[PDB]
């Protein structure tokens, strides 16, 4: 038998943590309608009173109200829901004092979840921004139409970057294999002013087009081997583990 604890503002508001292996004491006086909290997204199946005529049960979704309509009603409630089954031990109090207006719950495993996940997300974001252990290759040539030439170009073994000044127009970037065909690589834009076009590969030759203006980019320090992507993400400091289970 658990007992809810009084809140620090008014004793008619009390909280108790759900516990599957114990019952919860409910102390109701006559003439008060106590409102049970049921946690968000819970699916009611059926309930069962010790005395169906002792207390008035009304449910609107996940809200449960209880009110005595019988003298000397010492009974119990067993509500089975989506996941858990709540156990109550209703007791009438004849003083008409110290009522509970509502009963709200605390769920331990849930809080163990959210508190862990917030720390995990903060750590992940910190790891991404704290990038360390990287080398950069800066040897790139152009050939062609310099009107749309980027102001800088490099790579980090995994991503190839381009930077355009404020007044230029972001062209498209095309994969060029050895034979000479052009093809598409996904691109993302990063940077404070979105002036950095980042493609997701490293290649000896890039192709830049804007309308009828063309420019070629050569990687004069192509690495056939490169660093393997063993972390499963764009950083060496973050794993990628499976929520899937199964």
């Amino acid at each position: 038998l658990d007992v809810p604890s009084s809140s620090r503002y008014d004793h008619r508001i009390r909280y108790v943590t759900y516990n599957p292996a114990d019952v919860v004491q409910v102390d109701t006086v006559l003439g008060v309608a106590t409102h049970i909290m049921l946690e968000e997204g819970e699916q009611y199946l059926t309930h069962a009173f010790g005395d169906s005529e002792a207390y008035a049960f009304a449910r609107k979704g996940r809200h449960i109200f209880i009110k005595p309509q019988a003298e000397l009603a010492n009974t119990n409630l067993i509500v089975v829901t989506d996941r858990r089954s709540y156990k109550f031990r209703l007791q009438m109090r004849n003083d008409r004092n110290g009522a509970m207006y509502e009963l709200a719950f605390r769920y331990p495993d849930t809080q163990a979840r959210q508190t862990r996940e917030a720390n995990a997300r903060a750590a992940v974001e910190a790891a991404f921004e704290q990038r360390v252990g990287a080398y950069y290759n800066l040897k790139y040539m152009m050939s062609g139409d310099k009107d749309i030439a980027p102001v800088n170009a490099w790579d980090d073994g995994r991503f190839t970057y381009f930077k355009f000044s404020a007044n230029a127009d972001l062209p498209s970037i095309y994969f060029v294999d050895a034979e000479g065909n052009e093809s598409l690589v996904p691109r993302t834009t990063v940077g404070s002013s979105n002036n950095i076009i980042a493609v997701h590969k490293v290649n000896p030759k890039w192709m830049i087009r804007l309308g009828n203006r063309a420019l070629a980019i050569f990687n004069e320090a192509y690495d056939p081997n490169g660093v393997p992507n063993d972390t499963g993400t764009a950083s060496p400091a973050v794993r990628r583990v499976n929520k899937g289970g199964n």
Partner: peptide, 28 residues
């Protein structure tokens, strides 16, 4: 006796370096 025109391949003569200055974002 005709086919799709191909986009202009840039010439390969006035090849020059791209990064006249070192990029700032490199923290260098």
């Amino acid at each position: 006796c005709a086919s799709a025109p191909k986009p202009k391949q840039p010439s390969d003569f006035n090849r020059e370096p791209v990064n006249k200055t070192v990029p700032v974002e490199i923290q260098r």
